[PDB]
Amino acid sequence: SEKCFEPQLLRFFHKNEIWYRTEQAAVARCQCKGPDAHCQRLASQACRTNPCLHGGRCLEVEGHRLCHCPVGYTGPFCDVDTA
């Protein structure tokens, strides 16, 4: 019943929970086994409009827009300062 830690989200997930993890290109969908996650890399597309701040790359999967943030920023839109 160990949980899985996702550093991109600073969040622990329970067994069977599912979340997205970004790379520069592209996105992966992860499910917690505990403590390890099993992830599947998905083909994503670029968002037409980019809501990501500070150089974030916007990746679209399930029509849903994710931001791959640069160092110094995090959050849904690279809007949370890490410093």
Swiss-Prot record:
Highest taxon of source: Eukaryota
Covalent S-S links between cysteines: C4-C32, C30-C39, C47-C58, C52-C67, C69-C78
TM spans (from-to): none
Limits of the Fibronectin type-I domain: 2-42
EGF-like domain span: 43-79
Protein name (record): Coagulation factor XIIa heavy chain
Gene symbol of the encoding locus: F12
Residues of the full protein shown: 133 to 213 of 615
